[PDB]
Write a protein that binds this ligand. Structure first.
Ligand SMILES: N[C@@H](Cc1c[nH]c2ccccc12)C(=O)O
Ligand SMILES: [K+]
Ligand SMILES: [K+]
Ligand SMILES: [K+]
Ligand SMILES: [K+]
Ligand SMILES: [K+]
Ligand SMILES: [K+]
Ligand SMILES: [K+]
Ligand SMILES: [K+]
Ligand SMILES: [K+]
Ligand SMILES: [Mg+2]
Ligand SMILES: [Mg+2]
Ligand SMILES: [Mg+2]
Ligand SMILES: [Mg+2]
Ligand SMILES: [Mg+2]
Ligand SMILES: [Mg+2]
Ligand SMILES: [Mg+2]
Ligand SMILES: [Mg+2]
Ligand SMILES: [Mg+2]
Ligand SMILES: [Mg+2]
Ligand SMILES: [Mg+2]
Ligand SMILES: [Mg+2]
Ligand SMILES: [Mg+2]
Ligand SMILES: [Mg+2]
Ligand SMILES: [Mg+2]
Ligand SMILES: [Mg+2]
Ligand SMILES: [Mg+2]
Ligand SMILES: [Mg+2]
Ligand SMILES: [Mg+2]
Ligand SMILES: [Mg+2]
Ligand SMILES: [Mg+2]
Ligand SMILES: [Mg+2]
Ligand SMILES: [Mg+2]
Ligand SMILES: [Mg+2]
Ligand SMILES: [Mg+2]
Ligand SMILES: [Mg+2]
Lengths: 56, 117, 17, 142, 150, 110
RNA sequence: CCCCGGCGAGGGGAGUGAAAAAGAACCUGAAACCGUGUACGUACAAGCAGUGGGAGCACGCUUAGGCGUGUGACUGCGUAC
RNA sequence: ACGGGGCUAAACCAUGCACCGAAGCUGCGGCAGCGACGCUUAUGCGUUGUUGGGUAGGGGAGCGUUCUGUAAGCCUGCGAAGGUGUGCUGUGAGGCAUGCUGGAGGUAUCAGAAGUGCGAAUGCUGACAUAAGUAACGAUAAAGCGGGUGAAAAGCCCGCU
């Protein structure tokens, strides 16, 4: 099926009121390294909750 | 002599789009839709210059009817009594007195009840 | 072109004789 | 000079209380609608609500003439198909005494967001007592 | 217009407006609808109407004193410097000189001056008389034009 | 002080990139940089490079300080399109538009 | 020439020029179309979306006053070409 | 199967007097057409009477566009045409003045000639929307991991399954 009238630029923007992205509320700070990371994720060099889990 | 329609067409399109300011949607953006909107708005303005003289009289009647009934007389009997007393005050003025000078609108009602008597 | 085979198919097109 | 227009933020509204015992249903509802709308004031403006607040007491003792007591029927539709429901005047006074007066006054007011604002100034009670003693309602033999 | 007489698409079924040629004036690069041909714009004026309008022009120049009559007008050498000085003495800026016979030297002197025209009584035309601000006719030229208009 | 960085002819449509730019409008560049690092969108990589570059124009050219810069003004504009052809069934063909963008970031220390 | 970037694309400065919003996609640079900012309206309200009436608000102007501009709650009438 | 609320009259019959009610008629201001008659026109004015809904259609009078003469004139780098606002003005088509952009042309008056005016033709060409960040991403033979390079590796190279 296809439209009978051209939907306006307000109906288009109302449909997109639910299309926004949500920012990450906070980043946890590592216990020893002191660097931010996603919560429950290892940091960018392999520290997770103090210990170094990936010595790479 | 070849004549190009460019400068002149733009002036005449921009005239109609200038009168269509405040209209929702394509009626203030698109010439085709805005031309019909400006024409239909000129028919309403002509028709409503006649109704402005009716809507306002209808309002003046209804404020005299309400102020007169506070003095114990209806509109139809109050207007008759002023013709019998040869008072030629306007309905636009009578409805004005009813709001701003309630002691002068009273004095008019005694004048009308007397002649109606 | 012209088709839109269902605008050529004459069972679909020639439905009201 | 232009005609005076009442301003929504400076209109004076007052509280009245009406007893509805033995009044005729429709011949009372027209006086309610007249004052709910403001037609009794020299400041009446069509697009402003200049009316008064009205309390109606004893709503279950209102009266109808003729055989309307058992023959007046109130229909409404629920939206679902086949949902046409009716009640007589007898049955609504039994169940919803206040609804009978409010239906009558509501059909006599203007339709639209201003006529719905007039209807909010009508307080209707089935009994004889009301909680608005703080508003100091005056008595109306209307 | 250069092109083909092929029909761009068939008459029915396409969903497009009927077209029959790529050279029609509706289309871009098509013909002109009422295209021009070379034309002759010359009109006819009766001999009497032409001569009757020179008499009005001439008798009107006299009324507004733009007709100046002399008996000799000539320069001794074909030099634009000489004719320029001669015209300054008579206080003339732009002028049409009408002479009985075309002087060999007065012609060559006057053609670098854009506000000066030297002409023979046989070749005066209506637009020249109205155009220039002053007209100078030698005496032998006045009698030549009087007979020509009769 | 106001500082600009642009990315003209970015290769993604404006509607997709506007989702990302609306996250960092009005934030400080410190918060903005770490928000952009943890959104899994292609447009966040593009926008982050324009932001890190505006920050750099502020010290070298304007002599500002990172600790108090804010993303005062960010927007995306529709750019030119590259038009292609997508062959469809039964002999028909379509028109693909590969849409681009212009990303502008403005950082101000005030 | 310097700076961010991938020894990128793109940009910010510096410089040339009368002009660089004349920067090679380069005179002028309209409209549709798409955005960012500010003022006002809008989440109990039914329809060719205007027109007549009209409060409130915002910004100007000048006063011993209400005028201009923007918006338009509520309201009569109104079924495009 | 009163337009509705409602109505025992807010129904019907008879009489009467008020009022409401139209772009009808009157009041006040203005414009134009046609007659009659005159300060005497000079083609106009004054008094007066009257008319002024309009399709097909007939009659009259104009605006603006490009080009030719007037014009080797006049305006213009102290800012032309074009673009974009604002104000004033005419019964209309329109005109005029000016802020900003623009950076070299424009053209009075009065005559002349027309490729002289666009919303429609399933009109023609170019740009750009809508549906919509939706369907789809082309055989249901199938991948998993380690190392390398690299700004970045599910897909590239190397190795084992
Ligand atoms: N419907 C089938 C067969 C078909 C092809 N061309 C047609 C024309 C008319 C009717 C049917 C057809 C298809 O599209 O492959
Ligand atoms: K050919
Ligand atoms: K020469
Ligand atoms: K420029
Ligand atoms: K524009
Ligand atoms: K309205
Ligand atoms: K200009
Ligand atoms: K068209
Ligand atoms: K889309
Ligand atoms: K697949
Ligand atoms: Mg079709
Ligand atoms: Mg051609
Ligand atoms: Mg001959
Ligand atoms: Mg396919
Ligand atoms: Mg094929
Ligand atoms: Mg420079
Ligand atoms: Mg140039
Ligand atoms: Mg340009
Ligand atoms: Mg609300
Ligand atoms: Mg409700
Ligand atoms: Mg009725
Ligand atoms: Mg009357
Ligand atoms: Mg009237
Ligand atoms: Mg009339
Ligand atoms: Mg007529
Ligand atoms: Mg010319
Ligand atoms: Mg011009
Ligand atoms: Mg034409
Ligand atoms: Mg038409
Ligand atoms: Mg194009
Ligand atoms: Mg499309
Ligand atoms: Mg869908
Ligand atoms: Mg789906
Ligand atoms: Mg899918
Ligand atoms: Mg595949
Ligand atoms: Mg791997």
């Amino acid at each position: 099926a296809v439209q009978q009238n051209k939907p306006t630029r307000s109906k288009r923007g109302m449909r997109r009121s639910h299309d926004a992205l949500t920012a990450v509320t906070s980043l946890s700070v590592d216990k020893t390294s002191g660097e931010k990371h996603l919560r429950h994720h290892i940091t960018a060099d392999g520290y997770y909750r103090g210990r170094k889990v990936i010595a790479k | 002599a070849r004549v190009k329609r460019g400068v002149i067409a733009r002036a005449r399109h921009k005239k109609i789009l200038k009168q269509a300011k405040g209209y929702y949607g394509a009626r203030s953006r698109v010439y085709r839709v805005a031309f019909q909107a400006v024409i239909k708005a000129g028919q309403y303005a002509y028709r409503d210059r006649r109704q402005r003289k009716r809507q306002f009289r209808q309002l003046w009647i209804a404020r005299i009817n309400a102020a007169a009934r506070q003095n114990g007389i209806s509109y139809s009997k109050f207007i008759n009594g002023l013709k019998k007393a040869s008072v030629e005050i306007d309905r636009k003025i009578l409805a004005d007195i009813a709001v701003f000078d309630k002691v002068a609108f009273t004095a008019l009602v005694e004048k009308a009840k007397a002649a109606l008597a | 072109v012209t088709s839109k085979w269902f605008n050529i198919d004459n069972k679909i097109v020639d439905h009201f004789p | 000079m232009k005609t005076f227009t009442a301003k929504p933020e400076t209109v004076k509204r007052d509280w009245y209380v009406v007893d509805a015992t033995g009044k005729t249903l429709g011949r009372l509802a027209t006086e309610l609608a007249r004052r709910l709308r403001g037609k009794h004031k020299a400041e009446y403006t069509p697009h402003v609500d200049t009316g008064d607040y009205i309390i109606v007491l004893n709503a279950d003792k209102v009266a109808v003439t003729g055989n309307k007591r058992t023959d007046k029927v109130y229909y409404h539709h629920t939206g679902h198909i086949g949902g046409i429901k009716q009640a007589t005047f007898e049955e609504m006074i039994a169940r919803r005494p206040e609804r009978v007066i409010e239906i009558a006054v509501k059909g006599m007011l203007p339709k639209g967001p201003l006529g719905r604002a007039m209807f909010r100034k009508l307080k209707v009670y089935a009994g004889n007592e009301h909680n608005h003693a703080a508003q100091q309602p005056q008595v109306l033999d209307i | 217009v250069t092109g083909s007489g092929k029909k761009p698409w068939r008459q029915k079924g396409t969903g497009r407006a009927r077209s029959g040629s790529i050279k029609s004036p509706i289309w871009r690069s098509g013909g002109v609808t009422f295209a021009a041909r070379p034309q002759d714009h010359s009109q006819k004026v009766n001999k009497k109407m032409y001569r009757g309008a020179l008499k009005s022009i001439l008798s009107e120049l006299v009324r507004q004193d733009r007709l100046i009559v002399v008996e000799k007008f000539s320069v001794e050498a074909p030099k634009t410097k000489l004719l320029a000085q001669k015209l300054k003495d008579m206080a003339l800026e732009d002028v049409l000189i009408i002479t009985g016979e075309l002087d060999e030297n007065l012609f060559l002197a006057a053609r670098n001056l854009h506000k000066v025209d030297v002409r023979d009584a046989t070749g005066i035309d209506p637009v020249s008389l109205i155009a220039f601000d002053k007209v100078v006719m030698t005496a032998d030229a006045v009698k030549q034009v009087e007979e020509m208009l009769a | 002080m106001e500082t600009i960085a642009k990315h003209r002819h970015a290769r993604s449509s404006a509607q997709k990139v506007r989702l990302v730019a609306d996250l960092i409008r009005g934030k400080k560049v410190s918060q903005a940089l770490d928000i952009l690092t943890y959104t899994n969108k292609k447009a966040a990589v593009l926008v982050k490079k324009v932001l890190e570059s505006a920050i750099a124009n502020a010290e070298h050219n304007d002599g500002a300080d990172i600790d108090d810069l804010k993303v005062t003004k960010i927007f995306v504009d529709e750019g030119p399109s590259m038009k292609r052809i997508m062959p469809r069934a039964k002999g028909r063909a379509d028109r693909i538009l590969k849409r681009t963008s212009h990303i502008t970031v403005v950082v101000s220390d005030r």
